[PDB]
Each structure stands twice: as structure tokens, then as C-alpha cells.
Amino acid sequence: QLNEAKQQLLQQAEYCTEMGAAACTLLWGVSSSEEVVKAILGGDKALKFFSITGQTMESFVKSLLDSDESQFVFALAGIVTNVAAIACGREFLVNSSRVLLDTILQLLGDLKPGQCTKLKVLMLMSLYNVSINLKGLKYISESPGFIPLLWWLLSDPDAEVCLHVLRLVQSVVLEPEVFSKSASEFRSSLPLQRILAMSKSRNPRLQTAAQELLEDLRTL
């Protein structure tokens, strides 16, 4: 009996991730539309969706993925990103889905450098989008361990992860008011050595990102 119970437990999970991957990929596909995002935000169904979204990403990252589960979480991370790309979407996420923003910040710290590189980029993109909203920048940069998270993520050798970290950093340093205490002290908390090292990188896009970020830092 035990074996029969475990057997269809596995059978229930593979169906669930299959449905999840199919439904959410369709949603991710159409979420690039502003009108689709506005429609999604309509109702309390947005709340329940983003709630269960954070749980699934968390539940899957903790299991460390097959091409089914991985496509599922990619879609979830892609939807959040595209919602956050719309002004009212990032405004909705910081007012109504701070738990999900916390989960995203947490999960970026659980993933060791080199695992789920594409999931990190997607999550980093959503954070960047949220940081365009003024409350969103405040909540993110006030999150405990936010700056340490940047160092942790910059230890990934993948250039695309590093490009998107520097994008997030670029966003945060352009706001001096939220700066932790002294502006010069906040600069010293940033991974300057890693940024300067990347300002001499083979990757052209990453080299320019780090080099421009270096300019902003020197002129404060």
C-alpha cells in the first residue's frame, strides 16, 4: 500500500507541474501586453495568484530541476517581471505583494552561484522593474541584507547575472535620499572591487555596465 501511495504521489506532481508549466507559460507569453497586465491586476484573483506564485518558486528552489518544473518557475518569474514593467503593476506589487518581493529576495540568496542562472536573471529583472517605483526602491534597498545579497550574486561567473546585478545597482545608487546614513559610507558597502574588475571584462555589455556604474560612484 505504501508503494502505491508513493507511486501516485509522483503521478500527481508530474501532472501538477505540467498544468502549471502550460498555463503559466501562456500567461507569461501574453503578459508583455499592458492591457493584459491591467486585466490581471483586476480583482482579488491577482492577490491569490501572486501569493501562490511565491510559494511555488520557494517550494521548487528548496528542492535543490527537470524541464517541466524549470519552465514552470521561469514562467512565474517572467510574469512578475512583466507586471513590474507596467507602472501600475510595480505599484501593485509593492502595495499588495510585499511577501512575494521578500520571497524573491530570499530565493536570490538560496541559489548558489551557477544554479538556475536564468531564474536569477528573471528575478533580478523584476527587482529592477520594482525599483523604478519609488516605494519599491525604498522597500528593496531597506530590506535587511540587500547589499550583502548584491555581493553574493556578483560571485556568479555568469556574465548575464552580473550584468543584471549591475543594472539593479545602477538603479539604487541614483537615489541619494534612501542612502544608508552617509553617502560615502554607502559607496564603501558596495562591491567596488568586483565592479572595477568587471570594468575590464571581455564581455562588451558587462564591461560598459560596470564602467558606467563606476562613473556614477566616483561623482558622489
Partner: peptide, 7 residues
Amino acid sequence: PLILVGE
């Protein structure tokens, strides 16, 4: 799964 990043 590949990802197109239109700004």
C-alpha cells in the same frame, strides 16, 4: 527555453 529581452 529561450528568452527575448525587449526593453
